[PDB]
RNA sequence: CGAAGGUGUGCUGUGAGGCAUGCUGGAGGUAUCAGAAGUGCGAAUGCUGACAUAAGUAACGAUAAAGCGGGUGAAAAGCCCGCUCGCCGGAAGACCAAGGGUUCCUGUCCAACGUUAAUCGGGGCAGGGUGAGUCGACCCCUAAGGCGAGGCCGAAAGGCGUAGUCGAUGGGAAACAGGUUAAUAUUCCUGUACUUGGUGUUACUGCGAAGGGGGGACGGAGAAGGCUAUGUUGGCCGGGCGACGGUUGUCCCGGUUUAAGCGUGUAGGCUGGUUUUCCAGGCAAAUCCGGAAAAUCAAGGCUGAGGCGUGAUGACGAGGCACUACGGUGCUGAAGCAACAAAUGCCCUGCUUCCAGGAAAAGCCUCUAAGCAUCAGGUAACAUCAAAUCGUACCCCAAACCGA
RNA sequence: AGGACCGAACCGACUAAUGUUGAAAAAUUAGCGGAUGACUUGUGGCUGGGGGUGAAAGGCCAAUCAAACCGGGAGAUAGCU
RNA sequence: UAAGGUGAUAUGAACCGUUAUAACCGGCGAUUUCCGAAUGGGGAAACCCAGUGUGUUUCGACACACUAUCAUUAACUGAAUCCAUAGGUUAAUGAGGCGAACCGGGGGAACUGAAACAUCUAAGUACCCCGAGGAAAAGAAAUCAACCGAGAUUCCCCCAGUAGCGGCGAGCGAACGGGGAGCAGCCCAGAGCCUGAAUCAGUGUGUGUGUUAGUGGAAGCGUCUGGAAAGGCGCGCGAUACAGGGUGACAGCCCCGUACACAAAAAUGCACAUGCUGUGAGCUCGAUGAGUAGGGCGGGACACGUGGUAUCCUGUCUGAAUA
């Protein structure tokens, strides 16, 4: 899942990055710590999505 | 502006223990895991933004990791910091 | 939560657990 | 009686610390020999 | 199984001169 | 349908050896002739691992000392609780500094350690525990000393050293009483305060230093006065009159604590002040220091423990009452005064003498040049903001630091 | 005032005893000398090997000193066992 | 390449994909905390404290880049004296350190041998410092030879334990010449004619070729022992593939492999053609390296130790000619 955001603009990409860092990351880690989390792949996939979005931002903005 | 994402990242997990429960029920304060640096101002801002509550003051401390042995291999636990954030009279969590 | 730590096979003079 | 070794972290660091070794080339050569021998503890440090 | 590193110096011999 | 190794046997050769096989083993070995040895062990006070010897012997690690009862447990002298006996008590008590890095508390086990057992531990596994604007580190300055831009010198390396920068063993701003957990507290909670700077308002004003002046800022020895921490007695509060004689009495038992900050500033110590005029001195100037003359009063000014009121009709408080996972928790809570003695601790970096002549800079008050003075900046009052980061467990004259 | 006197902490080890495969690779008990000065101690540095320091004994220089320790010449050489 | 995977100790739970964006490898990029030449200052290393300029939710406070040293060049300022210099400020390129050995140079021993030991040897070895490289140095005779002749340097074997040096003791030890590896000659010290004129250095295109991922790749069964057969016996096939590893005992035909044939979107090492920039062909003349050669004084290397002692260098004093 990369092409659906490869063509997005900087502002919307940053908004998506902020949304991903706020939701599904802080709540996910809190749930995992509290033990209410049942599936652990959520953290891995959200972290990989964050890394992918950061890479796209680095590639687009600047260079 | 990376202040928002820094505030998101500074907080790692909450802390649960008998002392934590006693402080929560008595002093209306919550103890939770924080980043290794986790400066007081950043912790206060992150708590304010995420928990949408009012905090009186934050005092932190660094916990030294214990030395444990798996098999015969010595293995020091990773160090971590905990912050005792004191909430206002109005508490949510 | 990760309860299982998978303690390895110990030496012959190992704690009885 | 008092033995030869009386520990003192500050004195140890200022006498045999990494900065003390690197101040002069001889200590730098000692560090190079340590690296070549591949010792995990390159020098005295906390 | 290390060999004894330090061995005390022998007791001085009795004067046989 | 059993190679090598191991293990006994019968033959065989003057011999180093050779042949076959009983059993283990489990998958490699190798006829004859040639080629090279890291080619043959019984010693070298030989090297590595193991096992005997002494020998089930010394010893079981200051002659401060254990007993009984109950409890858990399979097992109790050493593990938990109660009553007795003993030791330190200028320590064998409590804090720390340096030094260790979780040994601190709980649950859980006796695999290994404790010079014995152990249910126990500073032992094995799991969990919890270290909260700072007022503690210290951090940070400003600096002594001894280190580094050292340029610079000098030296075959190279490198040695010395200026400006500068480090370097606490020192100098700089601020918090105290009570309570709390199984483990944190001068950090958390209750009460009362304080210190340094940013921001904005109000009224004034000239501001401004790597520069100048004072301060910081100091040795030895010795005695007195005020005191305080501290301890003794008396009165007061609550309880007791008591198993071997008497004990309502001038008798016995426990308490009679209250900080920092705020105002007065005392005992004591230091010094003569107010004003005017002038000076190539303070590597430039100076209202600041120093010096030179005047009129005036004779006191002023600085430092200064302690005590006193507030802090505080607040906390604490002997003891009693009600429930106890029977370890313990909740409520209540009277008096909280006088005198004496007194320190090595404060006045005291004090005072008097002595030669052995007794650190430096920074913060701090003040002065102005450069520049600006409708600004900027400073002063006095108010409101708010921030004071970050690091250690806070535990041992710290010892079972935890240096001695294996 | 005393490089004063007696005597605690502190410093050192003059005598005796025990301990020599000891509690300790110089220790413990009682005596013993100084204990206001040439005293001692905590902390931080300076003096580095034919050199340092030395109230000077050939003493100390990390339990080793008439020339420390570490690595190299180096498997120095040994007419010796 | 791909239908199995989220690395191992060391299983699990939760998942992705299964015809392609599951997983893995490769080429090119991005991120790359702190200490570490650390490079803003300091410092006991993974730590503390700053200034400048760029933009921002409560002034609060934040994110980014720079601020080390030296060398060279350039610009602006700038004293003791006018000029001027030294110095000061700013801009640009390079180095600073690490790394096993090889090279050259500046230093540089001792033990031991001579049956002792000082000349000597050990030895220009042990070891320190400096500089660059993939090799470095050297290198085209002010050389030899002998009056016959060879034409750069380096390395291998003879000459050769020869001649020689040597308390003529121990020991050290050549050269000429011969056979081989490989051979490239030039540039400055200067004028005129002709002036891209060959050979090089710096960048693109094309062709060739190798790497960084890889693909295909032949051929055996039945019977007996036997835990298991690749082993006993029978009959077969491949081989430009029985070189190797694993498979319940020794497998050519069980799998990975090997012989053999191919693959490259992208970056690459090397051989040529084709492009662009810089130094730069050939002809006539002259010039042809002065504080040098040499000598005196004391030494070092040449096998050669001062001996009858040539040659080169060196600390000091002198010192010509130039064809």
From Swiss-Prot, chain A:
Can you provide one Gene Ontology molecular function annotated for this UniProt record? structural constituent of ribosome
Example GO CC term: the record gives: cytoplasm
Question: What are its GO biological-process terms?
Answer: cytoplasmic translation; ribosomal large subunit assembly
Keyword annotations for this protein, in alphabetical order, are:
Ribonucleoprotein, Ribosomal protein, RNA-binding, rRNA-binding
Query: Which Pfam families does the protein's record reference?
Result: Ribosomal_L29
Domain of life the protein comes from: Bacteria
Q: Which phenotype arises from disrupting this gene?
A: Cells missing both S17 and L29 grow very slowly and have a rather unstable temperature-sensitive phenotype.
The answer to whether UniProt assigns keyword Ribonucleoprotein to this entry is yes
The record's note on quaternary structure and interaction partners says: Part of the 50s ribosomal subunit. Contacts protein L23, trigger factor and protein nascent chains. Might also contact SecE and probably does contact SecG when the SecYEG translocation complex is docked with the ribosome.
Q: Which family does it belong to?
A: Belongs to the universal ribosomal protein uL29 family.
What does the record give as the function of this protein? Binds 23S rRNA. It is not essential for growth.
In terms of NCBIfam families, this protein maps to:
L29 (TIGR00012)
Q: What is this protein called?
A: Large ribosomal subunit protein uL29
List the source organism.
Escherichia coli (strain K12)
Provide the gene name from the record: rpmC
UniProtKB/Swiss-Prot annotation, chain B:
Transmembrane feature ranges: none
Q: Which UniProt keywords apply?
A: Ribonucleoprotein, Ribosomal protein, RNA-binding, rRNA-binding
Q: GO biological process annotations for this chain's record?
A: cytoplasmic translation; ribosomal large subunit assembly
Q: Which GO terms describe its cellular component?
A: cytoplasm; cytosolic large ribosomal subunit
Residue stretches in coiled coil: none
Top-level taxon of the source organism: Bacteria
GO molecular function terms here?
Answer: rRNA binding; structural constituent of ribosome
Q: Name one Pfam family in it.
A: Ribosomal_L23
InterPro entries linked to this entry: Nucleotide-bd_a/b_plait_sf, Ribosomal_uL23-like, Ribosomal_uL23/eL15/eS24_sf, Ribosomal_uL23_CS
Q: Which family does it belong to?
A: Belongs to the universal ribosomal protein uL23 family.
Q: Its quaternary structure? A: Part of the 50S ribosomal subunit. Contacts protein L29 and trigger factor. Might also contact SecE and probably does contact SecG and SecY when the SecYEG translocation complex is docked with the ribosome.
List the NCBIfam families hit by this protein, alphabetically. Answer: PRK05738.1-1 (NF004358), PRK05738.1-3 (NF004359), PRK05738.2-4 (NF004363)
**Function recorded in the entry:** One of the early assembly proteins, it binds 23S rRNA; is essential for growth. One of the proteins that surround the polypeptide exit tunnel on the outside of the subunit. Acts as the docking site for trigger factor for Ffh binding to the ribosome (SRP54) and to nascent polypeptide chains.
What is the name attached to this protein's record? Large ribosomal subunit protein uL23
Q: Which organism is it from?
A: Escherichia coli (strain K12)
The beginning of the lineage is: Bacteria, Pseudomonadati, Pseudomonadota, Gammaproteobacteria, Enterobacterales
Q: Which gene encodes it?
A: rplW
UniProtKB/Swiss-Prot annotation, chains C, E:
What superkingdom does the record give? Eukaryota
Protein known as: Apidaecin-1B
Source species of the chain: Apis mellifera (Honeybee)
Question: Which classification does the entry list for the species?
Answer: Eukaryota, Metazoa, Ecdysozoa, Arthropoda, Hexapoda
Please indicate which part of the intact protein appears here, giving the first and last residue numbers and the full length.
Answer: 44 to 60 of 144
From Swiss-Prot, chain D:
User: What is the protein's quaternary organization?
Assistant: Part of the 50S ribosomal subunit.
Recorded hits in Pfam families, A to Z, give: Ribosomal_L34
What start and end residues bound the annotated signal peptide? none
Protein name, UniProt field: Large ribosomal subunit protein bL34
The protein's organism comes out as Escherichia coli (strain K12)
Give an example GO molecular function. structural constituent of ribosome
Q: Which GO terms describe its cellular component?
A: cytoplasm; cytosolic large ribosomal subunit
Instruction: Give the family from UniProt.
Output: Belongs to the bacterial ribosomal protein bL34 family.
Sorted alphabetically, the Gene Ontology BP terms of this entry are:
cytoplasmic translation
